[PDB]
Structure formats: C-alpha cells, structure tokens
Enzyme design. Structure first.
Site, short mmCIF file in Angstrom:
data_model
loop_
_atom_site.label_atom_id
_atom_site.label_comp_id
_atom_site.label_asym_id
_atom_site.label_seq_id
_atom_site.Cartn_x
_atom_site.Cartn_y
_atom_site.Cartn_z
CG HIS A 41 -0.69 0.16 2.41
ND1 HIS A 41 -0.92 -0.73 3.42
CD2 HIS A 41 -0.16 1.26 2.97
CE1 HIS A 41 -0.47 -0.20 4.56
NE2 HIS A 41 0.01 0.99 4.30
N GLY A 143 2.20 6.38 9.68
CA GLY A 143 3.64 6.28 9.41
C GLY A 143 4.25 5.00 9.97
CB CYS A 145 2.25 0.91 7.41
SG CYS A 145 0.55 1.33 7.86
C1 LIG Z 1 -6.81 6.18 3.68
C2 LIG Z 1 -5.78 5.24 4.28
N1 LIG Z 1 -6.42 3.96 4.50
C3 LIG Z 1 -5.71 2.70 4.49
C4 LIG Z 1 -4.33 2.64 4.53
C5 LIG Z 1 -3.70 1.40 4.54
C6 LIG Z 1 -4.48 0.25 4.51
C7 LIG Z 1 -3.85 -1.13 4.50
N2 LIG Z 1 -3.39 -2.17 4.51
C8 LIG Z 1 -5.86 0.40 4.47
N3 LIG Z 1 -6.43 1.60 4.46
#
Ligand SMILES: CCNc1ccc(C#N)cn1
Ligand SMILES: CCNc1ccc(C#N)cn1
Lengths: 304, 304
Positions: A41, A143, A145
């Site tokens: 992502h 941050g 992740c």
């Molecule tokens: C708008 C940000 N939303 C997110 C970000 C990362 C993930 C994952 N895996 C799911 N949604």
C-alpha cells in the site's frame, strides 16, 4: 524474582529498518540481505485505498519510483516484485547489519515483539500476541506501517509480522513477511470487523504458573477439574478451549510448581466464576493472556 | 491508535553490555568509552555479603582480578576505582559502540527502560518506574545485577539505573551510574523493608488522558474538583499528592482532549471511590501509573 511483559532486545531489528517513499506515501521497510520488504500500500494515494488494483497501480511504478533511505544514505533500487500484500525491493547493497533470520507465520496465541517505527526510525518496542481473531492490539500511529514483529532464538530473528492497517475499532491487522494477512483482512479502506477476541487460555495458565513461582498464591484453590468440565466454563467466558496439546506444553511449569495442570485449571475456573474480588496477580487485576508457556519458562530461566 | 507499555529500542544499550567476573561472581557491566561500570558487590563471596567492608575487600583486588568480556573478546583492565556502590574498570579499548550518553539521577515517578542481561548478554527489555518508595518492580534473576535502566532522547542515552539487589519482598533496588542507591537501600545481605508503594497520581492522570484519546471514555464523569479536595481522596487511597507542578505538566494533554486537569482529577476521584466495576481502561482493570505525561505525549505523537 518479578515478572514483566518483556520484549526481545531490539538492536538486531533496529539495524534492518529503513524508510520507503513512493511519491507522497512514506512508511517503513525491512532491509535483509539486498531486499527491502514493505507494505504494498506504499504505492497508493488515500483515494487509491478505497478499492485498489495493486497489479494495475504497480504498472506505473519503476525501480527509481521507490525511495529507500537507510539512516541518511540512499539505497539504489535495482528490482522490485509484489508477493501477496508486500513489495520486495532489490537494492544493490546487502544490509551489512543483516542478522541471521527466518520468516515464520505464527499461530493465534503466539507472542512477539514489535519495533514501532516512523520514517525508518525506531520509536519503541513492546510485546504483542496474535489474538484468536487474527488481530493484534498494538500502538501504531500514521507512518508506522512496515513496522515488524519478531521473536529471537539466541542470534536468529524470526520475523512473523509486518504492520499494514488499523480497523475502525482501533485494533491492528498485518501480514507475515510473505505478505499474507493474518486472518481475513485485506489492504483496503473498507468495512472489516474483527471476530470475537477470546482469551488465550493456555497463556493465562502459563501466567498463573509464573505467578505461583513469584509467591502470588492467594488464588490457589482446593479443587481439580477435567478438560471437558473446564472447557464448559471456558466457552461460557469466551476462553479458547484447552486441549491435551496445551496441557502437554504446560508440563514443565507443572513439574516446577508441583501443581498439576488440571489443578491450575480448576483454580482458573474459580477466578472466572468469582473474579479477583479487588485482588491482583503479578500486578494485574485481570487474567493476563499475552505470555506463552515458552515466554514464562524463558523469563523465569533468564535465556539470552 | 492503541496504547502500549513501550520500552525504548535497546540496541544502543545492547552495544554497551559486557560480562564482569571477579573470581566466582559473574554479573553485567556497562562499557562506555574506556570504562566498565558494574556493581561493587562483584568483589564479594556470598559470605562477604553478610556485612561487607568494600574498601577492605578491594585492597585484595588488582586490575588483573576483574575479567571483562565483550562478546567473546577479553578487555584489558588498566585501572579500577570505587565510586559509591559501583566499580569503574578502566580498559585499554574505548567501546567502539559507545553512544552519546549522560548519567542522570531520576526522581520517583519517572519511568525508564530496563535491558535485563545475564553474562553480559541481553535477554529482554521492559518499562519500569522509579516507585515513590525508591524501589522498582523489575524482572531480575541471579546474574542480572549490572543490568541498566535508561531513557533515550533521539540519539542520547540517559542512563538512570543499575540493578544491585532484590529485597525479601521481591522488589528491586539499585543505584544511579554514580553508584548512589535510590532510596535508603544498601548493598548488604541484611533486613531492608520498603516503605509504602503509593500510586503516582500524575502518571495515572496522564494515562487517563491517553485513554480518552483512544476513545475509552466510559469513566468520564459530570464532576470537577479542586487540588485540595482531590488530595483528601488521594491520601485516603495511598496516591501521591497532586501539586500545581503536576497540573502544569498535564497541560498539553488537557489542551488536546479539552478536558481540564481538575475535571480529569474529579473523574479519577470516582474511579478511586467506586472502582472500575469489572470494566477496563486501555486493557487494564487497575489504574496504570507507569506512564509519565512525557511518555503519553511521546507515544501519542510517535517520537523516534
Ligand atoms: C486512507 C488510508 N487507508 C488505508 C491505509 C492502509 C491500509 C492497509 N493495509 C488500508 N487503508
Ligand atoms: C548472598 C547474596 N546476597 C546479596 C547480593 C547482592 C546484594 C547487593 N547489592 C545484596 N545481597
């Protein structure tokens, strides 16, 4: 004496954390040998996260679109591939701090340490368990992740978790280092409810053993039980069913305290049916379930 | 989201741990620049610990009587001195992993990370607080003495604790890195009872702030109080008195949640007078007091 929620020393993992930037998104990566692993992502805009097609989004991404910084030095990306929900960035420099390591996919109820990181920089380390609903209850801000979970056997790091996302209930979901989510979760900004967060009974029992060894003995009762009788109570209180495999694993702790596993069960049965009554065990007013039998043995024996 | 008992990443301290052996006794030392710091009780037999005269015992000890091993390499001891309850072994090799560091003597209620070690090898890291009775509640087995407590500001390690001993009640006592014990404790195998282990009220309030930020809001009440009214309740429940200095320190958390410090006090007052009633806050059934206001800000803001 004393019994603490203890993390593994983090230095071996600290030496592997990098910052990964794809355009506007920065998160953490794990640099082992000449590959950087990160959540896929990192390729997405916030708009992309609504219903992302990762193979489609990746067509527009070249090696030079993945900025990798290790400390304040840039790494040269010479290849990239997607594996399930992770990216693998090949860099032209082996991490010179690469520890001995393995990738392991853990089972629910197994514990691990998390090195929470931001911008590739370690902020803190804490102990987690994989919950029975395949969530973890972490401490992760925007941050974080790509922060990882791990166990250490002497000098070998077994990486078991990479952080991907926070559910609307503020519990955490992620992948093993092959990029496969724990549980049913997906990397999308969509409705994902966790199942029942049941208590990890074998871990509670381990911790009761940890308690008795430390002299915190008040809850020891005059009773025994059977697996089937105990499990009737477990099911009522949303505890995991205890199996003979769990009894076998608690054998060394049984052998130390001279308290038969089923006796300790019958005592847990009373804590469940009567509560602590304003009393505490190892400084807790609830029954702690994020220590495995292995953790209790390790901490009580001082393994390094 | 999520709020965890978090330790500092340990690698910078891991790089400083060595094994110190004087005859039969092995424990840990801290190697910074070309000095190794360790508990002075490394010179003692178990018989010596009954009523030791350290200056007398040290007359019989020469540089070559202090075995220092860093990993599996020996260090050459070229001088030694006693400073209060620690030894300072001068070695002929600066620790090449010496971080930026300071020695700080902390106040009760301040938190720190401990890197529990055996034979100079790190086993685990956990978060402690200096209790108001100047004990800590650690996890220390035989061989853990010389394990250290520390805080980290970006790249500077502030060492605040070195482990020396376990009281008969299984709580822990030690020194700053100048060798001065916290509290009234002495390095002798003699009767040492700890005073009242009161609750660190300012830390409880910080953690309640941490809670509300995470949406765990049920305990918020319709009341306010005054410092004097709150303190009447604090004293009854063996909480530390709250001062205006503590109110000032909680200001940033007040500013974030829009809950005035005295409102949060009045709510703590109700938790104290009525208990949780089988409910939990941030996964705890008791009021947690080993997070400082600084810890809460740090964790809630993701400082690295
Ligand atoms: C708008 C940000 N939303 C997110 C970000 C990362 C993930 C994952 N895996 C799911 N949604
Ligand atoms: C018999 C061992 N007893 C000990 C050991 C260390 C210390 C200190 N400080 C006090 N007593």
């Amino acid at each position: 004496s004393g019994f603490r929620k203890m993390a593994f020393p983090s230095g071996k993992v600290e030496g592997c954390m990098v910052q990964v930037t794809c355009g506007t998104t920065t998160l953490n990566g794990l640099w082992l040998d000449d590959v950087v692993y990160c959540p896929r992502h990192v390729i997405c805009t916030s708009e992309d996260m609504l219903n992302p097609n990762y193979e489609d989004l990746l067509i527009r991404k070249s090696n030079h679109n993945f900025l990798v910084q290790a400390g304040n030095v840039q790494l040269r990306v010479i290849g990239h591939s997607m594996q399930n929900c992770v990216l693998k960035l090949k860099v032209d420099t082996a991490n010179p701090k690469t520890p001995k390591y393995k990738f392991v996919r853990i089972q629910p109820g197994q514990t691990f340490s998390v090195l929470a990181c931001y911008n590739g920089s370690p902020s803190g380390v804490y102990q987690c368990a994989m919950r029975p609903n395949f969530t973890i209850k972490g401490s992760f801000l925007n941050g974080s992740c790509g922060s990882v979970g791990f166990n250490i056997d002497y000098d070998c790091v077994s990486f078991c978790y990479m952080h991907h996302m926070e559910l609307p209930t503020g519990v955490h979901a992620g992948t093993d280092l092959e990029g496969n989510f724990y549980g049913p979760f997906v990397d999308r900004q969509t409705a994902q409810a966790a199942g029942t967060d049941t208590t990890i009974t074998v871990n509670v029992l381990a911790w009761l053993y940890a308690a008795v060894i430390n002299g915190d003995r008040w809850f020891l009762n005059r009773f025994t039980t059977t697996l089937n009788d105990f499990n009737l109570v477990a099911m009522k209180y949303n505890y995991e069913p205890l199996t003979q495999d769990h009894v076998d694993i608690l054998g060394p702790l049984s052998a130390q305290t001279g308290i038969a596993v089923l006796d300790m069960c019958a005592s847990l049965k009373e804590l469940l049916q009567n509560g602590m009554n304003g009393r505490t065990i190892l400084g807790s007013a609830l029954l702690e379930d994020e220590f495995t039998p292995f953790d209790v043995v390790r901490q009580c024996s001082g393994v390094t």
